Ligand SMILES: C[S@@+](CC[C@H](N)C(=O)[O-])C[C@H]1O[C@@H](n2cnc3c(N)ncnc32)[C@H](O)[C@@H]1O
Protein backbone atom coordinates (compact mmCIF):
# COMPACT_ATOMS: atom_id res chain seq x y z
CA UNK A 1 0.00 0.00 0.00
CA UNK A 2 1.26 3.43 -1.05
CA UNK A 3 2.49 6.48 0.82
CA UNK A 4 -0.66 8.48 1.50
CA UNK A 5 -1.20 12.25 1.54
CA UNK A 6 -2.82 13.94 4.54
CA UNK A 7 -4.16 17.47 4.00
CA UNK A 8 -5.02 19.58 7.05
CA UNK A 9 -7.00 22.78 6.50
CA UNK A 10 -5.46 24.47 9.53
CA UNK A 11 -7.64 27.59 9.38
CA UNK A 12 -9.95 29.56 7.12
CA UNK A 13 -8.59 33.04 7.91
CA UNK A 14 -6.63 34.62 5.06
CA UNK A 15 -4.81 37.84 4.18
CA UNK A 16 -5.84 37.99 0.49
CA UNK A 17 -9.04 38.76 -1.39
CA UNK A 18 -9.27 36.30 -4.27
CA UNK A 19 -12.41 36.59 -6.39
CA UNK A 20 -12.93 32.83 -6.70
CA UNK A 21 -12.45 31.68 -3.10
CA UNK A 22 -14.80 31.51 -0.13
CA UNK A 23 -11.98 32.45 2.29
CA UNK A 24 -11.28 35.88 0.79
CA UNK A 25 -11.05 38.42 3.65
CA UNK A 26 -11.80 35.69 6.19
CA UNK A 27 -10.92 36.65 9.74
CA UNK A 28 -12.33 33.34 11.02
CA UNK A 29 -10.91 32.48 14.42
CA UNK A 30 -10.55 28.67 14.24
CA UNK A 31 -6.98 27.39 14.56
CA UNK A 32 -6.07 23.71 14.39
CA UNK A 33 -4.00 23.18 17.52
CA UNK A 34 -0.64 21.65 18.32
CA UNK A 35 -2.57 19.40 20.72
CA UNK A 36 -4.86 18.23 17.90
CA UNK A 37 -1.81 17.52 15.74
CA UNK A 38 -0.09 15.44 18.42
CA UNK A 39 -3.14 13.19 18.75
CA UNK A 40 -3.50 12.97 14.97
CA UNK A 41 0.14 12.15 14.15
CA UNK A 42 0.17 8.51 15.42
CA UNK A 43 -3.16 7.88 13.68
CA UNK A 44 -1.65 9.22 10.45
CA UNK A 45 1.48 7.09 10.88
CA UNK A 46 -0.57 3.91 11.29
CA UNK A 47 -2.89 4.90 8.42
CA UNK A 48 0.06 4.82 6.02
CA UNK A 49 0.51 8.59 5.64
CA UNK A 50 3.89 9.71 4.36
CA UNK A 51 3.04 13.32 3.45
CA UNK A 52 1.25 16.03 5.43
CA UNK A 53 0.22 19.18 3.53
CA UNK A 54 -0.97 22.25 5.43
CA UNK A 55 -3.55 24.45 3.70
CA UNK A 56 -6.69 26.32 4.60
CA UNK A 57 -6.99 29.95 4.18
CA UNK A 58 -3.42 31.15 4.57
CA UNK A 59 -1.25 28.68 6.55
CA UNK A 60 1.49 31.30 7.18
CA UNK A 61 -1.10 33.27 9.27
CA UNK A 62 -1.12 30.22 11.64
CA UNK A 63 1.40 31.07 14.35
CA UNK A 64 2.23 27.37 15.01
CA UNK A 65 2.83 26.30 11.40
CA UNK A 66 6.62 26.04 11.76
CA UNK A 67 6.28 24.01 14.98
CA UNK A 68 3.70 21.82 13.20
CA UNK A 69 6.26 21.22 10.44
CA UNK A 70 8.90 20.37 13.08
CA UNK A 71 6.75 17.77 14.84
CA UNK A 72 5.54 16.29 11.55
CA UNK A 73 9.11 15.94 10.27
CA UNK A 74 10.28 14.39 13.56
CA UNK A 75 7.61 11.71 13.07
CA UNK A 76 9.07 10.91 9.64
CA UNK A 77 6.51 12.83 7.57
CA UNK A 78 7.33 14.78 4.42
CA UNK A 79 5.88 18.20 5.25
CA UNK A 80 4.33 20.55 2.68
CA UNK A 81 2.58 23.94 2.82
CA UNK A 82 0.31 25.69 0.31
CA UNK A 83 0.65 29.47 0.59
CA UNK A 84 -0.26 32.57 -1.35
CA UNK A 85 3.38 33.46 -0.63
CA UNK A 86 2.86 36.95 0.82
CA UNK A 87 4.62 35.98 4.06
CA UNK A 88 6.84 33.30 2.54
CA UNK A 89 10.14 35.26 2.25
CA UNK A 90 9.92 36.17 5.95
CA UNK A 91 9.22 32.61 7.15
CA UNK A 92 10.92 30.35 4.58
CA UNK A 93 14.23 30.12 6.43
CA UNK A 94 12.58 29.01 9.69
CA UNK A 95 10.30 26.64 7.77
CA UNK A 96 13.24 25.04 5.95
CA UNK A 97 15.13 24.70 9.24
CA UNK A 98 12.05 23.05 10.76
CA UNK A 99 12.25 20.36 8.06
CA UNK A 100 9.86 21.65 5.38
CA UNK A 101 10.11 19.30 2.40
CA UNK A 102 8.00 21.23 -0.15
CA UNK A 103 6.50 24.68 -0.58
CA UNK A 104 3.53 25.29 -2.88
CA UNK A 105 2.89 28.92 -3.90
CA UNK A 106 -0.31 29.88 -5.72
CA UNK A 107 0.33 32.13 -8.74
CA UNK A 108 -2.54 32.96 -11.09
CA UNK A 109 -0.73 35.22 -13.53
CA UNK A 110 2.55 35.73 -15.31
CA UNK A 111 3.44 38.99 -13.55
CA UNK A 112 2.64 41.08 -10.48
CA UNK A 113 0.48 43.35 -12.65
CA UNK A 114 -2.05 40.57 -13.16
CA UNK A 115 -1.68 38.17 -10.22
CA UNK A 116 -1.80 40.97 -7.62
CA UNK A 117 -5.04 42.16 -9.23
CA UNK A 118 -6.68 38.72 -9.15
CA UNK A 119 -5.80 38.36 -5.45
CA UNK A 120 -6.17 42.10 -4.68
CA UNK A 121 -2.88 42.04 -2.78
CA UNK A 122 -0.15 44.31 -4.16
CA UNK A 123 3.24 42.69 -3.66
CA UNK A 124 1.96 39.11 -3.37
CA UNK A 125 3.43 37.93 -6.69
CA UNK A 126 6.92 39.31 -6.00
CA UNK A 127 6.96 37.86 -2.48
CA UNK A 128 5.80 34.47 -3.77
CA UNK A 129 8.61 34.51 -6.35
CA UNK A 130 11.22 35.58 -3.79
CA UNK A 131 10.02 32.85 -1.46
CA UNK A 132 10.18 30.23 -4.22
CA UNK A 133 13.78 31.14 -5.13
CA UNK A 134 14.81 31.13 -1.47
CA UNK A 135 13.04 27.80 -0.96
CA UNK A 136 14.94 26.22 -3.86
CA UNK A 137 18.21 27.67 -2.56
CA UNK A 138 17.40 26.10 0.84
CA UNK A 139 16.75 22.63 -0.60
CA UNK A 140 12.95 22.82 -0.35
CA UNK A 141 11.06 21.34 -3.31
CA UNK A 142 9.30 24.30 -5.03
CA UNK A 143 5.87 23.80 -6.61
CA UNK A 144 3.36 26.31 -8.01
CA UNK A 145 -0.44 25.95 -8.14
CA UNK A 146 -2.21 28.02 -10.81
CA UNK A 147 -5.95 28.51 -11.30
CA UNK A 148 -6.64 29.22 -14.98
CA UNK A 149 -9.79 30.49 -16.65
CA UNK A 150 -11.02 32.86 -19.37
CA UNK A 151 -9.42 35.77 -17.50
CA UNK A 152 -5.80 34.59 -17.45
CA UNK A 153 -5.20 31.69 -19.89
CA UNK A 154 -3.20 33.89 -22.29
CA UNK A 155 -0.69 34.42 -19.48
CA UNK A 156 0.23 30.77 -19.10
CA UNK A 157 3.03 30.76 -21.73
CA UNK A 158 4.63 33.68 -19.89
CA UNK A 159 4.11 32.06 -16.48
CA UNK A 160 5.80 28.89 -17.77
CA UNK A 161 8.92 30.90 -18.62
CA UNK A 162 8.82 32.69 -15.25
CA UNK A 163 8.51 29.46 -13.30
CA UNK A 164 11.21 27.73 -15.38
CA UNK A 165 13.69 30.59 -14.89
CA UNK A 166 12.91 30.73 -11.15
CA UNK A 167 13.81 27.06 -10.63
CA UNK A 168 10.30 25.82 -9.80
CA UNK A 169 10.23 22.04 -10.21
CA UNK A 170 6.48 21.27 -10.25
CA UNK A 171 3.47 23.15 -11.60
CA UNK A 172 -0.20 22.35 -11.09
CA UNK A 173 -2.28 24.14 -13.74
CA UNK A 174 -5.96 23.47 -13.07
CA UNK A 175 -9.23 25.05 -14.10
CA UNK A 176 -11.12 27.77 -12.27
CA UNK A 177 -14.07 26.16 -10.47
CA UNK A 178 -17.25 28.15 -9.83
CA UNK A 179 -20.93 27.59 -9.19
CA UNK A 180 -21.89 29.53 -12.31
CA UNK A 181 -21.10 28.47 -15.85
CA UNK A 182 -17.66 29.45 -17.15
CA UNK A 183 -17.45 30.08 -20.89
CA UNK A 184 -14.50 30.97 -23.06
CA UNK A 185 -15.08 33.25 -26.07
CA UNK A 186 -12.78 31.16 -28.31
CA UNK A 187 -11.78 27.65 -27.17
CA UNK A 188 -9.60 27.18 -30.28
CA UNK A 189 -7.53 30.15 -29.13
CA UNK A 190 -7.14 28.56 -25.67
CA UNK A 191 -5.68 25.47 -27.35
CA UNK A 192 -3.58 27.65 -29.66
CA UNK A 193 -1.90 29.45 -26.77
CA UNK A 194 -1.78 26.62 -24.22
CA UNK A 195 -1.02 23.52 -26.31
CA UNK A 196 2.59 24.79 -26.71
CA UNK A 197 2.80 24.95 -22.91
CA UNK A 198 1.97 21.25 -22.58
CA UNK A 199 3.97 20.32 -25.73
CA UNK A 200 7.13 22.03 -24.48
CA UNK A 201 10.34 20.09 -23.86
CA UNK A 202 10.05 18.99 -20.19
CA UNK A 203 13.84 19.25 -19.79
CA UNK A 204 13.89 22.89 -20.92
CA UNK A 205 10.46 24.16 -19.79
CA UNK A 206 8.37 23.29 -16.74
CA UNK A 207 5.37 21.25 -17.90
CA UNK A 208 2.28 21.01 -15.64
CA UNK A 209 1.33 17.85 -13.74
CA UNK A 210 -1.37 15.40 -14.81
CA UNK A 211 -4.03 16.33 -17.35
CA UNK A 212 -4.37 19.53 -19.33
CA UNK A 213 -6.73 21.91 -17.60
CA UNK A 214 -9.16 21.82 -20.53
CA UNK A 215 -8.90 18.07 -21.00
CA UNK A 216 -6.67 15.63 -22.90
CA UNK A 217 -9.20 14.00 -25.24
CA UNK A 218 -11.59 15.70 -27.67
CA UNK A 219 -14.49 14.46 -25.52
CA UNK A 220 -13.01 15.91 -22.32
CA UNK A 221 -12.28 19.21 -24.08
CA UNK A 222 -15.79 19.38 -25.52
CA UNK A 223 -17.21 18.77 -22.05
CA UNK A 224 -14.97 21.37 -20.41
CA UNK A 225 -15.57 24.13 -22.95
CA UNK A 226 -19.30 23.49 -23.51
CA UNK A 227 -20.73 22.25 -20.18
CA UNK A 228 -18.08 23.51 -17.71
CA UNK A 229 -17.24 19.99 -16.41
CA UNK A 230 -13.60 19.96 -15.44
CA UNK A 231 -11.38 16.96 -16.27
CA UNK A 232 -11.48 14.24 -13.63
CA UNK A 233 -10.09 10.78 -12.96
CA UNK A 234 -10.90 8.72 -16.04
CA UNK A 235 -11.49 5.02 -16.74
CA UNK A 236 -13.76 3.13 -14.37
CA UNK A 237 -12.28 4.07 -10.97
CA UNK A 238 -10.78 6.97 -9.11
CA UNK A 239 -7.74 5.77 -7.16
CA UNK A 240 -7.07 9.08 -5.41
CA UNK A 241 -9.62 8.17 -2.71
CA UNK A 242 -7.26 5.47 -1.42
CA UNK A 243 -4.19 7.70 -1.10
CA UNK A 244 -5.56 11.08 0.09
CA UNK A 245 -7.17 12.21 3.34
CA UNK A 246 -8.30 15.85 3.56
CA UNK A 247 -9.16 17.19 7.02
CA UNK A 248 -11.47 20.20 7.24
CA UNK A 249 -10.11 21.30 10.61
CA UNK A 250 -12.82 23.81 11.55
CA UNK A 251 -15.68 21.41 10.96
CA UNK A 252 -15.27 17.84 11.92
CA UNK A 253 -14.77 16.35 8.48
CA UNK A 254 -12.38 14.03 6.65
CA UNK A 255 -12.62 13.72 2.87
CA UNK A 256 -11.11 11.12 0.56
CA UNK A 257 -9.50 13.71 -1.74
CA UNK A 258 -8.47 17.34 -1.75
CA UNK A 259 -11.32 18.47 -4.02
CA UNK A 260 -13.70 17.45 -1.15
CA UNK A 261 -16.21 15.40 -3.14
CA UNK A 262 -19.90 15.79 -2.33
CA UNK A 263 -22.88 13.74 -3.43
CA UNK A 264 -25.36 15.74 -5.50
CA UNK A 265 -28.52 15.01 -3.51
CA UNK A 266 -26.89 15.27 -0.08
CA UNK A 267 -27.56 18.12 2.36
CA UNK A 268 -25.54 16.44 5.15
CA UNK A 269 -21.90 17.40 5.78
CA UNK A 270 -19.59 15.80 3.26
CA UNK A 271 -16.94 13.25 4.03
CA UNK A 272 -16.96 11.55 7.42
CA UNK A 273 -16.42 12.68 11.02
CA UNK A 274 -12.81 13.15 12.06
CA UNK A 275 -13.74 12.23 15.65
CA UNK A 276 -15.77 9.40 17.17
CA UNK A 277 -16.52 10.12 20.85
CA UNK A 278 -14.11 13.07 20.79
CA UNK A 279 -11.24 10.81 19.67
CA UNK A 280 -9.45 11.42 16.37
CA UNK A 281 -9.83 8.35 14.13
CA UNK A 282 -8.72 7.92 10.51
CA UNK A 283 -10.19 5.45 8.01
CA UNK A 284 -13.34 4.95 10.08
CA UNK A 285 -16.12 2.82 8.54
CA UNK A 286 -17.94 6.05 7.67
CA UNK A 287 -14.82 7.30 5.87
CA UNK A 288 -14.38 4.03 3.94
CA UNK A 289 -18.04 4.26 2.90
CA UNK A 290 -17.42 7.82 1.69
CA UNK A 291 -14.26 6.80 -0.19
CA UNK A 292 -15.94 3.72 -1.70
CA UNK A 293 -18.74 5.80 -3.22
CA UNK A 294 -16.33 8.05 -5.09
CA UNK A 295 -13.94 5.21 -6.01
CA UNK A 296 -16.63 3.92 -8.38
CA UNK A 297 -18.76 7.05 -8.96
CA UNK A 298 -16.10 9.79 -9.01
CA UNK A 299 -15.17 9.39 -12.69
CA UNK A 300 -18.89 9.88 -13.45
CA UNK A 301 -20.25 12.50 -11.02
CA UNK A 302 -17.32 14.70 -9.91
CA UNK A 303 -17.46 18.17 -11.46
CA UNK A 304 -14.71 19.90 -9.47
CA UNK A 305 -11.68 17.66 -9.89
CA UNK A 306 -8.11 18.85 -10.39
CA UNK A 307 -5.64 18.10 -13.16
CA UNK A 308 -3.16 16.76 -10.59
CA UNK A 309 -5.62 14.35 -8.95
CA UNK A 310 -6.90 13.12 -12.32
CA UNK A 311 -3.41 12.32 -13.61
CA UNK A 312 -2.53 10.71 -10.27
CA UNK A 313 -5.51 8.36 -10.41
CA UNK A 314 -4.85 7.53 -14.08
CA UNK A 315 -1.21 6.59 -13.36
CA UNK A 316 -2.40 4.22 -10.63
CA UNK A 317 -4.77 2.73 -13.23
CA UNK A 318 -2.28 2.48 -16.11
CA UNK A 319 0.97 1.86 -14.18
CA UNK A 320 -0.04 0.71 -10.70
CA UNK A 321 2.13 3.37 -9.03
CA UNK A 322 3.10 7.03 -8.75
CA UNK A 323 6.35 8.91 -8.30
CA UNK A 324 7.07 10.87 -5.10
CA UNK A 325 5.26 14.22 -4.87
CA UNK A 326 2.90 13.33 -7.73
CA UNK A 327 -0.01 14.83 -5.70
C1 LIG B 1 -7.87 27.60 -0.79
S1 LIG B 1 -6.12 27.87 -1.19
C2 LIG B 1 -5.36 27.79 0.45
C3 LIG B 1 -3.83 27.86 0.44
C4 LIG B 1 -3.23 29.24 0.17
N1 LIG B 1 -4.07 30.28 0.77
C5 LIG B 1 -3.05 29.45 -1.34
O1 LIG B 1 -3.81 30.14 -2.03
O2 LIG B 1 -2.11 28.92 -1.94
C6 LIG B 1 -5.70 26.24 -1.89
C7 LIG B 1 -5.63 26.21 -3.42
O3 LIG B 1 -6.93 26.23 -4.01
C8 LIG B 1 -6.97 27.12 -5.09
N2 LIG B 1 -8.33 27.65 -5.32
C9 LIG B 1 -9.01 28.53 -4.52
N3 LIG B 1 -10.22 28.76 -5.08
C10 LIG B 1 -10.34 28.05 -6.23
C11 LIG B 1 -11.36 27.91 -7.18
N4 LIG B 1 -12.52 28.57 -7.09
N5 LIG B 1 -11.15 27.08 -8.26
C12 LIG B 1 -9.97 26.39 -8.40
N6 LIG B 1 -8.98 26.52 -7.45
C13 LIG B 1 -9.16 27.33 -6.38
C14 LIG B 1 -5.97 28.20 -4.71
O4 LIG B 1 -5.48 28.91 -5.83
C15 LIG B 1 -4.89 27.41 -3.98
O5 LIG B 1 -3.88 26.98 -4.87
Ligand code: SF4
Pocket residue numbers: 014015016017018021022023024025056057058084106119
Ligand atom coordinates in the same frame (compact mmCIF):
# COMPACT_ATOMS: atom_id res chain seq x y z
S1 SF4 C 1 -5.12 33.39 -0.75
FE1 SF4 C 1 -5.76 31.13 -0.80
S2 SF4 C 1 -7.29 30.90 0.93
FE2 SF4 C 1 -6.95 33.15 0.62
S3 SF4 C 1 -8.63 33.85 -0.64
FE3 SF4 C 1 -6.92 33.28 -2.05
S4 SF4 C 1 -7.11 31.07 -2.60
FE4 SF4 C 1 -8.48 31.55 -0.82
Ligand code: SF4
Pocket residue numbers: 232233238239240241256257258259260261294295298299302304305306309310313
Ligand atom coordinates in the same frame (compact mmCIF):
# COMPACT_ATOMS: atom_id res chain seq x y z
S1 SF4 D 1 -12.59 12.06 -9.43
FE1 SF4 D 1 -13.65 12.97 -7.61
S2 SF4 D 1 -13.04 11.77 -5.80
FE2 SF4 D 1 -11.58 11.34 -7.53
S3 SF4 D 1 -9.90 12.80 -7.18
FE3 SF4 D 1 -11.32 13.76 -8.68
S4 SF4 D 1 -12.72 15.04 -7.34
FE4 SF4 D 1 -11.70 13.57 -5.98
Ligand SMILES: [Cl-]
Pocket residue numbers: 208209210311
Ligand atom coordinates in the same frame (compact mmCIF):
# COMPACT_ATOMS: atom_id res chain seq x y z
CL1 LIG E 1 2.69 14.21 -14.02
